[PDB]
Amino acid sequence: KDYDELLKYYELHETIGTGGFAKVKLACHILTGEMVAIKIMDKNTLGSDLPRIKTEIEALKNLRHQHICQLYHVLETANKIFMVLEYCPGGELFDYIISQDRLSEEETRVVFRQIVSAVAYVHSQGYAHRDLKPENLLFDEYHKLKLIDFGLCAKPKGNKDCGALAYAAPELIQGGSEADVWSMGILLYVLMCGFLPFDDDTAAALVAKIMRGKYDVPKWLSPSSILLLQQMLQVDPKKRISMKNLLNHPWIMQDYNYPVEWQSKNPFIHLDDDCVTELSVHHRNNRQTMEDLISLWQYDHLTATYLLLLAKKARGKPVRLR
Amino acid sequence: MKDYDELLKYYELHETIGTGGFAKVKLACHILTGEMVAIKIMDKSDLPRIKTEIEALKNLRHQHICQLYHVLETANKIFMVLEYCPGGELFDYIISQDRLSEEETRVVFRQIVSAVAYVHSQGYAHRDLKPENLLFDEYHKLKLIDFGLCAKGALAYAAPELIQGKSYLGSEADVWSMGILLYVLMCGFLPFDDDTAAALVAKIMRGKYDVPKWLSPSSILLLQQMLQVDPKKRISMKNLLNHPWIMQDYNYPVEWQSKNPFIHLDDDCVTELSVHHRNNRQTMEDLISLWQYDHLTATYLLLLAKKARGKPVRLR
Ligand SMILES: COc1cc(-c2cn[nH]c2)ccc1C(=O)Nc1ccc2c(c1)CC[NH2+]CC2
Ligand SMILES: COc1cc(-c2cn[nH]c2)ccc1C(=O)Nc1ccc2c(c1)CC[NH2+]CC2
């Protein structure tokens, strides 16, 4: 009874889940033929941490970006919440870092310009992620990074509602968007060094290192790398580099000579007309109210079919259902 | 990273297979033996539950229980090095096909029965038997997992006396759950199911269920012996092991006794660990016999499996 609605729309394959509450079940969307990943939560096993699932869904319903792992479809049965998500077979950025030694400056940049694109867009929409680390970034079948787990979340100019400690800003530990900038700075350091700037045996010694904020600057780090690191690793969050200045930073533009393009290429308001026409021939009605219907963004089957059609059109394969 | 330094002396890390807050599962290679392993990584979020499981798995050793090799505790993590189970959940198996045949469900059920009868012999009751908690190893052999709710779950699997406050448990509640499991294997869905949780409870108490046309009268008889609302009326484990349904095609009852020993030690393995350590031998055996669930416990038990798969009793 929990799978009857899900199985009208999706053919279920393997289990890259079998975690706690949330198993990932690789699956195929029947109409389009595109590969999806299905996050499965237990609506009466999840404890007092169902608010995290709801904070994530409501952030993912409002965020749309080339470097954010897309939500296609939400399904709620008796004891189960289902999230139909974008396909990421390439592993975590974490798995990437721990397989190789340390990355070169130009290799970290290629990566880091993608983290910056995503996190800058999050902040434009009034959100702050609050748990940026290399586990929470995944690689798609085209080697591009996707940001995941908005389980902790913002609206810092919104209504009243921590993460990994080695990534946590000083002001976070003692109680904005500037906390995320600190965490991108920790991320930048590990990519180039192969080790954290602050690490210890006990948690109480880790906190003391974050507050004092003194760190090692390895011999192989360039002076451009060092300068950007100290702008991002400011203990005072008012002294930390702004996103407007990060986007076009001299280290950030080496070998690219254009700034980070953060603005979304995945639209809410514009409707692709190849997709509207193919959905119209399938559902059998007029494109006028077809557009009106998609524009509700209910994150049902129609939202899943529209956005997956748009993903198939992006691949190169044709705009076709069955 | 300081949290991975101890682990990474012993294990080469692979695939990141399964997020979920505190509990993440990474695939790993044990460097000395070359044997594949699964690593459960806890973000040190109910840590009495992690500690009940480790404590139960340190004392349980069985061919149809997913083996613990090694426990590692760093600052912010707990690592459990567990048996390799690439074959998926029994759950995934059931939902891919429609329903299983009686003889296909017998092959599968006799393993569930072998494992659960051994759990109960050691003074334990699992309390969360369901098809998500039974995994297939690389030989298509079932391994029972998650002893986090065990005593010394899912409502559709919960016994009537469990729901309304016991007075008291424990082993007969497991028998009810094996009965729910038996039904789903043969039918392709539950004897008690509903849209709301409040309607599910009411169905479990009255205990009346549909008996599909394709279920044999042997299947029906065993089902009603296991699905007794009164736990005193429910079939005993002594009678389950040699039940006529349990034996129909097999010339013999369920062998529940462990083939994985704590006390008796393999000499071929012992003499290979001795050449590595540059120990005498009486010391070597005395040391394994501590069962500390460190690297020496991981290396001994993985050497025992390498010995069993036909490859040589040799370290790398
Ligand atoms: C384990 O995750 C995946 C594996 C494969 C895959 C593996 N092999 N081939 C494909 C493909 C995709 C995923 C995936 O997208 N998972 C995912 C998406 C969002 C979130 C999570 C996971 C973590 C839980 N918290 C919410 C955020
Ligand atoms: C989540 O996976 C496991 C959990 C436990 C466990 C949990 N609790 N106690 C033991 C024990 C073993 C595993 C495991 O080994 N799974 C696994 C192995 C290989 C592969 C996969 C999974 C993904 C599917 N594709 C093939 C690759």
Per DSSP, the residues of A42-103 read: ETTTSTT-SHHHHHHHHHHTT---TTB--EEEEEE-SSEEEEEEE--TT-BHHHHHHHSS--
Distance from Cα B85 to the centre of ligand 2, integer Å: 5
Contact B18 A24 (CB under 8 A): yes
Q: What are phi and psi of B136, to 5 degrees?
A: -100, 130
Give yes or no for a contact between B110 and B246, defined as CB atoms under 8 angstroms apart: yes
Cβ neighbour number for residue B183 with a 10 Å cutoff = 24
Q: Cβ(A179) to ligand 1 under 6 A? A: no
Catalytic position from the list B43, B46, B92, B128 = B128
Give yes or no for a contact between A224 and A144, defined as CB atoms under 8 angstroms apart: no
Distances (CA, A) of A127 to A156, A159, A267, B247: 7, 12, 18, 62
Q: Diameter of chain A by CA atoms?
A: 66
Tokens of residue B20, six digits: 């979920």
Contact A202 B89 (CB under 8 A): no
Strand partners, B24: B41
Of A20, A91, A95, the CB nearest to B20: A20
Contacting residues of A for B16, CB less than 8 Å apart: 91-92, 94-95
A16 CA: nearest ligand 2 atom: 23
Can you give the resolution of this entry in Å?
A: 2.5
SS3 B102: helix
Contact A49 B21 (CB under 8 A): yes
SS3 B135: strand
Helices (H), chain A: 6-9, 51-60, 93-99, 105-124, 170-173, 178-193, 203-212, 223-232, 243-246, 250-253, 273-283, 287-294, 301-315
Give yes or no for a contact between B29 and B37, defined as CB atoms under 8 angstroms apart: yes
Give yes or no for a contact between B267 and B303, defined as CB atoms under 8 angstroms apart: no
Give yes or no for a contact between A180 and A128, defined as CB atoms under 8 angstroms apart: yes
Distance from Cα A173 to the centre of ligand 2, integer Å: 35
Contact A15 B196 (CB under 8 A): no
Contacting residues of A for B88, CB less than 8 Å apart: 14-15
Give yes or no for a contact between A177 and A184, defined as CB atoms under 8 angstroms apart: no
* Those residues with Cβ within 8 angstroms of residue B102's Cβ, 6 or more apart along the chain or in another chain: B186, B216, B218, B219
Tell me how far apart the alpha carbons of residues B213 and B187 are, in angstroms, rounded to a whole number. Answer: 10
Distances (CA, A) of B113 to B106, B174, B255: 10, 10, 9
How many residues appear in chain B?
316
Give yes or no for a contact between A100 and A55, defined as CB atoms under 8 angstroms apart: no
Element (H, E) at B84: none
Amino acid at B220: I
Give yes or no for a contact between B54 and B68, defined as CB atoms under 8 angstroms apart: yes
Which residue, A82, A70, A116, is CA-closest to A9?
A82
Tell me how far apart the alpha carbons of residues B204 and B161 are, in angstroms, rounded to a whole number. Answer: 10
Task: Measure in Å the smallest separation between the Cα of B120 and chain A Cα atoms.
Answer: 25
Contacting residues of B for A17, CB less than 8 Å apart: 17-20
Q: Which of A18, A195, A199, A210 to mutate to test the interface with B (most CBs of B within 10 A)?
A: A18
Distance from Cα A258 to the centre of ligand 2, integer Å: 44
Instruction: Give A210: exposed, middle or buried? Use CB within 10 Å, 0-12, 13-18, 19+.
Output: buried
Q: Which residue among B40, B71, B85 is best mutated to probe the pocket of ligand 2, counting the most ligand atoms within 8 A of its Cβ?
A: B85
Tell me how far apart the alpha carbons of residues A127 and A121 are, in angstroms, rounded to a whole number. Answer: 9
Which residue, B74, B128, B288, B308, is CA-closest to A201?
B74
Tell me how far apart the alpha carbons of residues A180 and A184 are, in angstroms, rounded to a whole number. Answer: 6
Residue B133 per-residue DSSP state: G
Tokens of residue A185, six digits: 């700075």
Tell me how far apart the alpha carbons of residues B56 and B60 are, in angstroms, rounded to a whole number. Answer: 6
Say which residue the tokens 């000395």 belong to.
Answer: B32
Tell me how far apart the alpha carbons of residues B127 and B211 are, in angstroms, rounded to a whole number. Answer: 26
Tell me how far apart the alpha carbons of residues B113 and B119 are, in angstroms, rounded to a whole number. Answer: 10
Going by alpha carbons, the residue nearest to atom 25 of ligand 1 is A149
- Residue A85 CA to its chain's centroid (Å): 11
Tell me how far apart the alpha carbons of residues A305 and A243 are, in angstroms, rounded to a whole number. Answer: 35
Cβ neighbour number for residue B215 with a 10 Å cutoff = 15
User: What is B204-257 written as a DSSP string?
Assistant: HHH------TTS-HHHHHHHHHHS-SSTTTSPPHHHHTT-HHHHSSSSS----S
User: Binding site residues of B, as ranges?
Assistant: 17-25, 40
Q: What is the CA radius of gyration of chain A?
A: 21
Which technique was used to obtain these atomic coordinates?
X-ray
Cβ neighbour number for residue B55 with a 10 Å cutoff = 13
Tell me how far apart the alpha carbons of residues A217 and A234 are, in angstroms, rounded to a whole number. Answer: 15
Distances (CA, A) of B213 to B59, B186, B219, B220: 43, 11, 11, 10
Give yes or no for a contact between B52 and B147, defined as CB atoms under 8 angstroms apart: yes
Give yes or no for a contact between B258 and B63, defined as CB atoms under 8 angstroms apart: yes
User: Domain B1-316 - what CATH class?
Assistant: mainly alpha
Instruction: Please say whether the structural domain A1-322 has been given the CATH code 1.10.510.10.
Output: yes
Say which residue the tokens 């979020």 belong to.
Answer: B45
User: What is B299-311 written as a DSSP string?
Assistant: HHHHHHHHHHTTS
Give yes or no for a contact between A215 and A198, defined as CB atoms under 8 angstroms apart: yes
Element (H, E) at A130: none
The verdict on whether B128 is a catalytic residue reads: yes
Say which residue the tokens 């699956």 belong to.
Answer: A27
Helices (H), chain B: 7-10, 47-57, 90-96, 102-121, 160-163, 171-187, 197-206, 217-226, 237-240, 244-247, 267-277, 282-288, 295-308
Tell me how far apart the alpha carbons of residues A165 and A179 are, in angstroms, rounded to a whole number. Answer: 12
How many CA within 13 A on the CB side of residue B168? 4
Residue in chain A lying closest to B50 (CA): A20
Distances (CA, A) of B209 to B192, B228, B229: 7, 11, 12
Give yes or no for a contact between A221 and A230, defined as CB atoms under 8 angstroms apart: no
Instruction: Give A61: exposed, middle or buried? Use CB within 10 Å, 0-12, 13-18, 19+.
Output: middle
Dihedral sign, CA of B200, B45, A130, A99? negative
Residue in chain A lying closest to B39 (CA): A19
Helices (H), B122-196: 160-163, 171-187
Tokens of residue B50, six digits: 């992690």
Strand partners, A84: A38, A73
* Those residues with Cβ within 8 angstroms of residue A8's Cβ, 6 or more apart along the chain or in another chain: none
User: What is A149-175 written as a DSSP string?
Assistant: --SS---TTS------GGG--HHHHT-
Q: What is the CA radius of gyration of chain B?
A: 21
Across the beta sheet with B11-13, the strand order is B11-13, B23-30, B36-43, B77-82, B68-73
Report domain extents, chain B: 1-316
Q: Cβ(A24) to ligand 1 under 6 A? A: yes
Q: Cβ(A149) to ligand 1 under 6 A? A: yes
Task: Measure in Å the smallest separation between the Cα of B195 and chain A Cα atoms.
Answer: 6
Tell me how far apart the alpha carbons of residues A140 and A69 are, in angstroms, rounded to a whole number. Answer: 9
Tell me how far apart the alpha carbons of residues A70 and A308 are, in angstroms, rounded to a whole number. Answer: 10
Taking the CA of A90 as reference, the closest ligand is: 1
